[PDB]
């Protein structure tokens, strides 16, 4: 008997039953539903399907219960063991990459600039593929760790990310279809900031004006996480000042 | 956009989010939860897990919305293509089988005895295993089709079933563990009655006094589905009169 598992899991069970009754779900519908979720399970989409309708709500929760630079949903594509960089992120030399630059400061919720903070960054190849997770792509690519200096400053040069769709061929995709939504997410860059003394801050940031920023199939775009459009020497720039609490 | 999928699926999504907020589920809990359900998916327990907390409620629904001999949850172990029998069900000759006898009538909700109704029956080997689904067991065993005669009567001789537990080694088992329930179901026999003119009636029936009839881990035992204890010549007897609607 786990007090909390039994509080939260129970609350859900009790709550879904109600719907099963009120909406008057038939024997034949119930099968159709269960048959669906086994496909979802079969398709290894179990976590995905959850992430879409839920994870975004769970951020809205944490953002209420804490003081930090705006949080965002984490996403499936984070891999630990990213290489530390001065630096520049390792990216492919190819024509279709556009330079992106990321500057800023990591600091405490009490205001003190933190040094030796590790900023873990990952983002999509121009195709929408993440490294080491897609199509024979090296893991040291499009991933890296940034470490704030004596002033709590970090700067990194990298290629631009792109919007990508969650897998659209499966049960989740269509299910969104029936729900009048789509499979597309706006382009974003992934940050996880952890200082050995503080609570981890995981977030992603989008680009003002980018496609899908209005309609994110997951709901996890929020005004703060939209960066203004600023170029320097024809190089898109993100200036992000993180605040981790603790 | 499927009007109903979007009504019922939506209602659930909206309803689970509330819990995620109210109970104040953390980022770290959410993972733990999602991590759980992928195990459930990994363990091919996706349907099971649902059947336990839900399917029993879905009967309570149908039993409200229709006129029939009491319905019951279907269960995973029904296989179509059961052999028609006069008859007797094919069972193993072994010592530990106790004779069980099943008599009765199938009839319409308007009262007319139906003839040529097909009563599909399946039940557990003395071990708790179902045929063709367990341990190299022939499918013509512990399964059969009964066909009501000119009077709408059916009778079949068969071996006794036994209580069995839903798979207890996996994520569902323990999850019930945390919820203060168990893995055990009381002994029951499975009937599906379909006449080519009428709505299928699927139900199972338990034995008065049998273990677990009070505590069914799934909730799907109900007073009607408890048969009284009656022996004839030292042979347990079930007298069941089905009423299919339409
Ligand atoms: C194992 C849990 C996985 C995570 C669950 C997702 C978490 C939150 C989002 C889940 C969305 C709700 C799942 C409902 C899926 C319905 C599929 C469907 O309707 O197929 C359309 C279905 C067939 O089309 P399909 O989408 O290709 O399968 O439409 C039909 O023809 C039948 C009518 C469907 C109406 C059924 C209404 C919902 C009944 C489901 C009962 C079981 C719900 C248990 C889920 C509890 C969630 C905690
Ligand atoms: C894909 C859908 C499959 C069908 C879903 C089942 C349908 C109705 C029954 C579902 C029961 C609810 C599932 C919750 C499972 C919780 C697992 C757990 O707490 O592990 C204990 C977990 C670890 O132990 P474990 O059980 O071995 O994993 O306990 C912990 O240490 C962490 C605290 C757990 C508290 C989390 C509260 C629930 C958060 C889940 C958020 C996602 C819910 C989405 C489900 C929507 C359903 C429609
Ligand atoms: Fe991403
Ligand atoms: Fe059964
Ligand atoms: Mg600076
Ligand atoms: Mg600045
Ligand atoms: Mg008779
Ligand atoms: Mg009689």
Curated annotation (Swiss-Prot), chains A, B:
EC number: 1.13.11.-
Names of the cofactor(s): Fe(3+)
Catalytic function, reaction form: 3-chlorocatechol + O2 = (2E,4Z)-2-chloromuconate + 2 H(+); 3,5-dichlorocatechol + O2 = (2E,4E)-2,4-dichloromuconate + 2 H(+)
One Pfam family here: Dioxygenase_C
SUPFAM superfamilies: Aromatic compound dioxygenase (SSF49482)
Co-factor binding details: Binds 1 Fe(3+) ion per subunit.
Pathway: Aromatic compound metabolism; 3-chlorocatechol degradation
Binding-site positions, Fe cation: 130, 164, 188, 190
EC supergroup of this enzyme: oxidoreductase
Keywords: Aromatic hydrocarbons catabolism, Dioxygenase, Iron, Metal-binding, Oxidoreductase, Plasmid
A single GO molecular function term of this UniProt record: ferric iron binding
GO biological process, one term: catabolic process
Role description: Preferentially converts 3-chlorocatechol and 3,5-dichlorocatechol as opposed to other chlorinated catechols. Retains diminished activity toward non-chlorinated substrates.
Sequence similarity: Belongs to the intradiol ring-cleavage dioxygenase family.
Protein name: Chlorocatechol 1,2-dioxygenase
Organism: Pseudomonas putida
Source species taxonomy: Bacteria, Pseudomonadati, Pseudomonadota, Gammaproteobacteria, Pseudomonadales
The encoding gene: clcA
